[PDB]
């Protein structure tokens, strides 16, 4: 429940993070204009990415690890090849098919990339053609975050509709309509089982859902917690729910009961991103105080 | 603990030196936030200093100016307005001859936008600059269509004083914030002179806080 290492970030601010497949390396995204691939054990940065567009709000690390995706409000998604013959980092192709701000990019597969944008719709992209194969419409609000299943077949996205809409990747078809939120879904996360998911939003209430149930199992709310929720993540075995908050501290609620199991108050600033490794040894927390911190 | 670890240390030192140099190079440039509304004279203002947001860079004397034009965003403003928390100045453009155009007149809704952007929490202390546009047409055509509450003469000076006064009355939670207003003639040579003196005054007053003086 204490800090084990402190990356201290790179230069200014930190918005989003994504744990790699190796479970040793992470990607850090920030408004400064530099994307940094980090090492957890050695506390040494292993890659630096300049950005043509300074404004970036999302980052994705591929499950293979060959590619990393960064994008922002410029309407252009940039996918960079980490492993090149030159050894540099070069954007594979520009992805400019949205009229809004690219809120969250996620890597279904090397070929198939899912992007959520301010155009109030999502679209599957192919790297070879740079063309949308399936465009998921229906979200009235601008889709702010999507969570992908482990199977990479069914995924859910969330917007400023106070609702979540499931999507099938193959046919571009809305699969479920989840409702129960009172405010904009700031972030969404998928259960590692693939059968459920829980969300948090600005109404300071975390909410658990199941894809087939389409129903609220139980809400996680505290009277002292008026602070809105910016990040949600899960343990590998359940019985845990790590959650960022607007109160400048992170909190850990039990998945089944939501007691005040863990109080997490290291970061001085708003916890922008909260990520857990795929095997689950450590939790990484990032914020706009320029600091990245990994605890256990 | 071998040659691989020593080499990783050297590379990690290398990228940090490069990062520090790039940050020091970037810190000099002055960031400006343009908030042009429709036919507010965006083409005019970009000509006078000479699918997402449009970035421009103009150099005045010894000072660099990077200004980001948020144009045709077509999205909820709150979700990305805080990305410009660190900006030094917010430039506003408002047409003056839009007092005869109803979509809710454009002046009233522009006032509401100014009230919202002034009264927010992030912009507690950010200096606000506002420009004007189409004032010669406004003086030529002119009152009762948009502001019957004036009950004053259609004289351009008197009417323009009334309009600018009411717009500067939108200083909500702006005790620390300043409203530099300007009678933009739309043909004045360097209206960036107002911007340079305004940003210079802001830099001076913030330098006092940097020393702890004020």
């Amino acid at each position: 429940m204490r800090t084990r290492r402190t990356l201290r970030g790179h230069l200014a601010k930190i918005y989003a993070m994504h744990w790699g497949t190796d479970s040793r390396l992470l990607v850090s995204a920030s408004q400064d204009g530099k994307l940094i691939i980090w090492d957890s054990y050695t506390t040494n940065k292993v890659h630096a990415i300049p950005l043509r567009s300074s404004w970036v709000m999302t980052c994705a690390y591929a499950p293979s690890g060959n590619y990393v995706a960064c994008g922002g409000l410029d309407n252009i998604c940039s996918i960079y090849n980490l492993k090149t013959r030159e050894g540099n980092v070069r954007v594979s192709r520009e992805l400019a098919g949205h009229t809004g701000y690219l809120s969250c990019c996620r890597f279904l597969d090397d070929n198939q990339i899912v992007t959520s944008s301010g155009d109030t719709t999502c679209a599957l992209w192919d790297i070879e053609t740079g063309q949308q194969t399936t465009t998921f419409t229906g979200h009235t609000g601008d889709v702010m975050s999507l969570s992908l299943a482990p199977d990479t077949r069914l995924f859910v996205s969330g917007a400023c509709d106070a609702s979540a809409k499931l999507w099938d990747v193959r046919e571009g078809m809305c699969r479920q309509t989840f409702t129960g939120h009172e405010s904009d879904i700031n972030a969404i996360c998928f259960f590692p089982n693939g059968n459920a998911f829980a969300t948090g939003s600005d109404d300071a209430t975390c909410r658990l859902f199941d894809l087939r149930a389409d129903q609220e199992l139980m809400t996680y709310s505290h009277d002292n917690i008026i602070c809105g929720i910016t990040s949600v993540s899960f343990s590998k075995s359940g019985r845990l729910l790590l959650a960022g908050y607007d109160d400048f501290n992170c909190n850990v609620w039990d998945a089944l009961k939501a007691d005040r199991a863990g109080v997490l108050a290291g970061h001085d600033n708003r916890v922008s991103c909260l990520g857990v490794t795929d095997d689950g040894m450590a939790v990484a927390t990032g914020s706009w105080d320029s600091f990245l911190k990994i605890w256990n | 603990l071998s040659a691989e670890d020593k080499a990783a240390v050297e590379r990690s030192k290398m990228i940090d030196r490069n990062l520090r140099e790039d940050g020091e190079k970037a810190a000099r440039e002055v960031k400006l936030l343009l908030l042009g509304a429709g036919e507010s004279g965006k083409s005019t203002i970009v000509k006078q200093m000479k699918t997402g947001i449009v970035e421009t860079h103009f150099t005045f004397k010894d000072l660099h100016f990077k200004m980001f034009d948020v144009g045709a965003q077509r999205s909820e403003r709150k979700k990305w307005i805080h990305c410009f928390e660190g900006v030094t100045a917010i430039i506003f453009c408002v047409a003056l001859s839009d007092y005869d155009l109803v979509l809710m007149n454009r002046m009233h809704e522009s006032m509401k936008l100014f009230d919202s952007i002034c009264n927010n929490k992030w912009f507690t202390d950010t200096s606000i600059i506002l420009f004007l546009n189409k004032k010669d047409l406004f003086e030529e055509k002119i009152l009762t269509i948009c502001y019957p509450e004036y009950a004053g003469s259609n004289t351009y000076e008197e009417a323009a004083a009334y309009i600018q006064c009411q717009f500067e009355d939108l200083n909500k939670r702006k005790d620390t914030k300043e409203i530099y207003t300007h009678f933009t003639c739309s043909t004045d040579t360097k209206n960036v002179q107002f911007v340079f003196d305004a940003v210079t005054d802001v830099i001076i007053k913030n330098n006092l806080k940097d020393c702890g003086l004020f």
């Epitope: 390396l25 292993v46 030159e86 540099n88 | 603990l1 071998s2 040659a3």
Partner: single-chain antibody, 232 residues
């Protein structure tokens, strides 16, 4: 892709000095670390010199200290190495080598053409036999026998194995005992314990001929293996 062309590898008076340099193009040599490897006219690759990306750390061998010098040039994008006090053992077929260093990087991946230079403790590794007669289609194995264990405290051993095609630049087969290199068929696979090591050549055909080498990467004085010929 990449280009490494060495410059002016010729005759040198005994004990004298001569500037050698691998002209470089097509890669981020600013961000890449560089090595040099000697090849005696018949047998024996052994490491010579190291220059890092930031030109901060300079590591030499037992006979290499002082009498050699290394240098670089980032705007013109090339690599220099000056050698003084050249004798018979100092004559070798030096190969300009690039090697980037981080987690999962593949050092010693690309090589040049060579320096035709003719004039006029330490960890010990030896492969068992230097000659193995083979048949095009049956699986063989060759073993490099170290003298100390290569298993570091962090639980990951450091061990890189090399193939040399007859007359040309060598390649990297497998790095740190478990990871095959790019552009290499899967038929080659290293194996062994933390102290004893052996190859797994499977279904060899008429491009695997050449000499095979081993290397440690647990101490800064890197020393390759003796080399093993795989004749048909």
């Amino acid at each position: 892709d990449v280009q490494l062309v060495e410059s002016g590898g010729g005759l040198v008076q005994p004990g004298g000095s001569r500037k050698l340099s691998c002209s470089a193009s097509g890669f981020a040599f600013s961000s890449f670390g560089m090595h040099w490897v000697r090849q005696a006219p018949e047998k024996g690759l052994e490491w010579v010199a190291y220059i890092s990306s930031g030109s901060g750390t300079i590591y030499y061998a037992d006979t290499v200290k002082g009498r050699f010098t290394i240098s670089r040039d980032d705007p013109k994008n090339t690599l220099f190495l000056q050698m003084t006090s050249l004798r018979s053992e100092d004559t070798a077929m030096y190969y300009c080598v690039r090697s980037i260093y981080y987690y999962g990087s593949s050092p010693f991946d690309f090589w040049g053409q060579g320096t035709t230079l003719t004039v006029s403790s330490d960890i010990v590794m030896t492969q068992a036999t230097s000659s193995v007669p083979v048949t095009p289609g049956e699986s063989v194995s060759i073993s490099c026998r170290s003298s100390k264990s290569l298993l570091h405290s962090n639980g990951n051993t450091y061990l890189y194995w090399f193939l040399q095609r007859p007359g040309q630049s060598p390649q990297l087969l497998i790095y740190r005992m478990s990871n095959l290199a790019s552009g290499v068929p899967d038929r080659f696979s290293g194996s062994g314990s933390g102290t004893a090591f052996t190859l797994t050549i499977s279904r060899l055909e008429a491009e695997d001929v050449g000499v095979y080498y081993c290397m440690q990467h647990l101490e800064y004085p890197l020393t390759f293996g003796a080399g093993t010929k795989l004749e048909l």
